[PDB]
Amino acid sequence: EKGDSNIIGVWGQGGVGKTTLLHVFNNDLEKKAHDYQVVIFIEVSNSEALNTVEIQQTISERLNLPWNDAEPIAKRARFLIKALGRKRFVILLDDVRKKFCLEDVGIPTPDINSQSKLILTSRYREVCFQMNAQRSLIEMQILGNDASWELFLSKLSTETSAAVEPLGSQSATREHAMKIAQSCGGLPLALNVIGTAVAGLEEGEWQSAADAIATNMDNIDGVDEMFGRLKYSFDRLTPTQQQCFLYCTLFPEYGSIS
């Protein structure tokens, strides 16, 4: 609302509430009163090759335009630039991974003379900077301890939740659960996967699960998809950068490196 710069970038680690933030913001735009005529949600993350046809189809569908198949891509881009130039649009680009020209796909770059705002999300500060968003950049902070604990409970069955929730009386089950939850570091994706894996845990196996999770998460079910989910941040780097990155795992846990 108050921002003088109309291109807003939101960045955070892999799997830390971003797309969810866009979903909640989009659903919350419904309640408030605003002068923005059209709200468009675009997922450019579907490719690193800039699948332009899909984005143009989404924009045309959300603008009530008649979609054509044989139309050349550049002509449709020009037509959409002209069309979106006559409306106040809020376009939520989701999970951009490489710089791409907004005009080439068909999205006009908003300026101070126009009332449109373009919100885009990315894992990389560099991508947000390349899109002229440098002075409206938001770092997605991870969840706090209380929010982490509240989320962790919601992924447990009532049978297991009954042995963890109670307060007043202190039992090792709650401490072990907290030790498991605090190992996730408030990352919502990690919290979801870990809680789902240990949803059906009994009272006996809290000790062993807490002992193992603190050291190796490899054996926990569903973690493979989690790592495949974020792996891409690693593969984007040149092998020198990748080798330097694994070097940082040498140092002790939860410390600090000069």
């Binding site: 059906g200 009272e203 006996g204 699960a209 193992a212 054996n219 079910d221």
Partner: protein, 458 residues
């Protein structure tokens, strides 16, 4: 679960982690291939159809098994069948003697537990067992184990409940052994100073053994730095006092046993405070005992299994009222302790499930004269032969109580059962009809319902 994860760890299916075994068991539970079943969650059972599916898969697979457990076999299958399979299981059978010497190079797993008639086997049995990793001969009537110097891959051995006399000198030549359980051996005589010849033993267990570390002279386990689990049967004070020295071996006492102890008039958990892995505590025939001290010092160990046996001179056990080390106790058993007249501290055991008491002819009540019942997790209480036991305890809520058995307790006039509680988990009640009639009840509905639905007469 523990037996299965141990077998898997020895077999190499687990990467030196019992937690991965627990995770595999849990994954099998989630896929309904297995089912949790037992008084605790520690035991699992296999559905019959799923068992047949496993056998069908084995028959369709290349690695043939020879699985004939509990089929009432009086004669072991001929060595012709053995010669090709990879895992053999003839446990829980009734075989007497084993004569042939199979030529099985490929065998990796073998079980002979729960055979009461197995006592004699052919010598040179294990010459062909070069690929063996797991072997079990527990709950059998054998006396000695033949020459085994050819076990170049043995990792797990357990002779629990066996009348084993002496270990063979060939055992010390096996450097791949990791697990060695020799519990409930009422015929063991060999010296354990020879166990130092091993290098990579991870588990040792002499729990409730007829012979063990009687004095500090036999205490030579400090050589085995690869040990993480030790089971020790103690016969003298000096063993405990030498164990009361700071080193990882001392802290590795998960289960501790006392048998025929001399100069053990007293014992303190503060002396056991060095032991942070202590769970099981068993005392038997240690008459020299007078009193037991349970200090308020909350040692990091969480005691859950305690059992007392044959302690005529033991008078009382002091327990801290405001907080005690027994708050984690799961089961208590007291047997043959005539001079016990203080057990009231049991009322502070919130996590108590199973009780068996027999012939403790000095006890008035289990509990004599938080906002919750003292035994909400209670499941089982057993009394037998208590001449002076006036009652069990005052009326308390036992929502999860399942079984009760009392026989020959003339002084037991009343039991804490009442119709004010909810009853949907009770399954059976045992005892003598005469003592059933001799009991005094606060409501007659406690008589009719229990006597017609869950009373099993003797």
């Amino acid at each position: 679960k523990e037996q299965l994860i141990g077998y898997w760890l020895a077999e190499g299916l687990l990467l030196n982690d019992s937690e991965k075994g627990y995770q595999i068991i849990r994954s099998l539970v989630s896929a309904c291939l297995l089912q949790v079943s037992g008084s605790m969650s520690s035991k699992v059972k296999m559905h019959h159809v799923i068992r047949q599916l496993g056998l069908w898969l084995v028959n369709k697979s290349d690695t043939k098994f020879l699985v004939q457990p509990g089929m009432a076999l009086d004669n072991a299958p001929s060595a012709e069948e053995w010669n090709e399979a990879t895992r053999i299981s003839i446990m829980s059978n009734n075989i007497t003697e084993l004569s042939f010497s199979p030529k099985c190079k490929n065998v990796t797993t073998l079980l002979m537990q729960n055979n009461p008639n197995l006592n004699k086997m052919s010598y040179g049995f294990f010459r062909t067992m070069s690929s063996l990793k797991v072997l079990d001969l527990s709950h059998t009537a054998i006396t000695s184990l033949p020459e085994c110097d050819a076990l170049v891959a043995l990792e797990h051995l357990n002779l629990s409940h066996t009348h084993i006399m002496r270990l063979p000198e060939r055992l010390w030549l096996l450097k791949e052994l990791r697990h060695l359980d020799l519990s409930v051996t009422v015929a063991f005589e060999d010296t354990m100073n020879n166990c130092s010849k091993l290098h990579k033993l991870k588990v040792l267990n002499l729990f409730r053994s007829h012979y063990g570390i009687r004095d500090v002279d036999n205490l030579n386990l400090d050589s085995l730095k690869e040990l993480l689990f030790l089971g020790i049967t103690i016969y003298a004070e000096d063993v405990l006092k030498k164990l009361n020295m700071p080193r990882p071996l001392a802290k590795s006492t998960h289960r501790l046993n006392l048998k025929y102890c001399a100069e053990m008039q007293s014992i303190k958990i503060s002396d056991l405070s060095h032991m942070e892995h202590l769970e099981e505590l068993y005392v038997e025939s240690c008459y020299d005992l007078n009193t037991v001290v349970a200090d308020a010092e909350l040692t990091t160990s969480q005691l859950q299994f305690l059992t007392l046996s044959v302690l005529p001179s033991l008078e009382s056990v002091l327990v801290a009222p405001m907080s005690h080390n027994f708050q984690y106790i799961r089961k208590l058993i007291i047997s043959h302790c005539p001079k016990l007249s203080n057990i009231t501290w049991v009322r502070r055991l919130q996590l108590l499930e199973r009780l068996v008491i027999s012939h403790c002819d000095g006890v008035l009540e289990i509990v004599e004269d938080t906002g919750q019942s003292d035994f909400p997790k209670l499941r089982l209480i057993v009394l037998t032969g208590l001449k002076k036991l006036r009652s069990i305890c005052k009326a308390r809520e036992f929502p999860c109580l399942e079984t009760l058995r009392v026989e020959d307790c003339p002084n037991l006039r009343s039991i804490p059962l009442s119709c004010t509680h909810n009853y949907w988990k009770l399954k059976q009640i045992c005892g003598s009809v005469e003592w059933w009639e001799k009991l005094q009840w606060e409501n007659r509905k406690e008589v009719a319902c229990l006597d017609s639905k869950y009373f099993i007469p003797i």
